[PDB]
Nucleic acid binder design. Structure first.
Ligand SMILES: [Ca+2]
Length: 314
DNA sequence: GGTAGACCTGGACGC
DNA sequence: GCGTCCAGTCTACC
C-alpha cells in the first residue's frame, strides 16, 4: 500500500493534478524518446524518475497530468513543487500553436503530426544533459539508458528507494572529475566514452571556470553556446546541439544524427547542395541543420522532436 | 580544408 | 550458435 511505486488508483490522496490535455503532452512519446534517459514506466502508463532532486511518478488522463512526489509524512505535491513539473515540461509553451504553424508551412509535418501529438521538449539541467549526451554518441537509446543509470548509481547522491529500485540524483562535476572515475565508468561499460566523461568533467572545473561557465551559456547566443560546448572531449556538433536545444534554451538548434538524415532523405527528398559530399560529413550535417531551421522556423528544434519521436515509434 | 577508419557494447538479423 | 551491422567524435592524412 504505502510501499512500492505509487499508482493513481491505489493512493488517490497522494496525487495532485495539473491541467494539461494529451494534445499538449504525451508522456509515452516524450519520456522514452531520447530527450531524457531518466524515466521508467515502472507501472503501465506511470512514469517515474528524478525531477528537481526528488523522485516523482507521473501519469495522465485525457485532460489532466497527475503527479506524486516521494520526498516526512507522505502527502500530495505542493503548488510550489508542481510548478517544478510545469517548468520541466515547459508547459507555458502551447504545443498546439507550434504544431499549427509547422503544419501550415510543411504538409508532410502536418500529415505526421496528426498521429503524434503532444511531443514537446523537456527543459533539462545542463550537467545532466551534457553528460547524458556525451554517453549517447555512436550508441542506441537502450544502452545509453543503462549507462546513465549505472553512472548515477555509482557517482550520484542516493535519494529514495521504491520496490527494488534505488533512485540517485545526477552526479556533480566534482564527483565526475574525481580520481579513477574513468576506470570505474569503464567497468560500468561506458566504453571509450568513459574518458570523455572524466576528461570533460575536469576540463570544465579546471579550465573553463566550472559550473558557472556552463550555466552562463543559457543567456548566451546559440552560435556562442554551441561553439563553447564543442571544446569539451566527446562533444561534437550533434552532442552540442542536443545540449543547446534541451538544456540551454536554444529552440532553433537542430540535432543532426542518423534519424534526421533518414527523415530528410525519405520524406523531403533532401540532398546537400552547397556541401562537397553526398553523405554525412561535418559540412553536410551543418547544411541539413540549416535546411530544417529554414523550413520550420525559430522552434525548428522542437519540430524535429515530433518527427524523431514518430520515427522511433515505427 | 575536407575525408576515411577506428572505436566500447550488446541487441539484431543473416545464414 | 558466430560474424557482421548499428545505434557520433576524434584523428591521421591528402
Ligand atoms: Ca552509425
Amino acid at each position: 500500500g504505502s510501499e512500492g511505486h505509487r499508482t493513481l488508483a491505489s493512493t488517490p490522496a497522494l496525487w495532485a493534478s495539473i491541467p494539461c490535455p494529451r494534445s499538449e503532452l504525451r508522456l509515452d512519446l516524450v519520456l522514452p524518446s531520447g530527450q531524457s534517459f531518466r524515466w521508467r514506466e515502472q507501472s503501465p502508463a506511470h512514469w517515474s524518475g528524478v525531477l528537481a532532486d526528488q523522485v516523482w511518478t507521473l501519469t495522465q488522463t485525457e485532460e489532466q497530468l497527475h503527479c506524486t512526489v516521494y520526498r516526512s509524512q507522505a502527502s500530495r505535491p505542493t503548488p510550489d513543487e508542481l510548478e517544478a513539473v510545469r517548468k520541466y515540461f515547459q508547459l507555458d509553451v502551447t504545443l498546439a500553436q507550434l504544431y499549427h504553424h509547422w503544419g501550415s508551412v510543411d504538409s508532410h509535418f502536418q500529415e505526421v503530426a496528426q498521429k503524434f501529438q503532444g511531443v514537446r521538449l523537456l527543459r533539462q539541467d545542463p550537467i545532466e544533459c551534457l553528460f547524458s549526451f556525451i554517453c549517447s554518441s555512436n550508441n542506441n537509446i537502450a544502452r545509453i539508458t543503462g549507462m546513465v543509470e549505472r553512472l548515477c548509481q555509482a557517482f550520484g547522491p542516493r535519494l529514495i528507494q521504491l520496490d527494488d529500485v534505488t533512485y540517485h540524483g545526477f552526479p556533480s562535476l566534482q564527483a565526475l572529475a574525481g580520481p579513477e572515475v574513468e576506470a570505474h565508468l569503464r567497468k560500468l561499460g561506458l566504453g571509450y566514452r568513459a574518458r570523455y566523461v572524466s576528461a570533460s568533467a575536469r576540463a570544465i572545473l579546471e579550465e573553463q571556470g566550472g559550473l558557472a561557465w556552463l550555466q552562463q551559456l543559457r543567456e548566451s547566443s546559440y552560435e556562442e553556446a554551441h561553439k563553447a560546448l564543442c571544446i569539451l572531449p566527446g562533444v561534437g556538433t550533434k552532442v552540442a546541439d542536443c545540449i543547446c536545444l534541451m538544456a540551454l534554451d536554444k529552440p532553433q538548434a537542430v540535432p543532426v544524427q542518423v534519424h534526421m538524415w533518414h527523415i530528410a532523405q525519405r520524406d523531403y527528398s533532401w540532398h546537400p547542395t552547397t556541401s562537397q559530399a553526398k553523405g554525412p560529413s561535418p559540412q553536410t550535417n551543418k547544411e541539413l541543420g540549416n535546411f530544417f531551421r529554414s523550413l520550420w522556423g525559430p522552434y525548428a528544434g522542437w519540430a524535429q522532436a515530433v518527427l524523431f519521436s514518430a520515427d522511433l515509434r515505427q
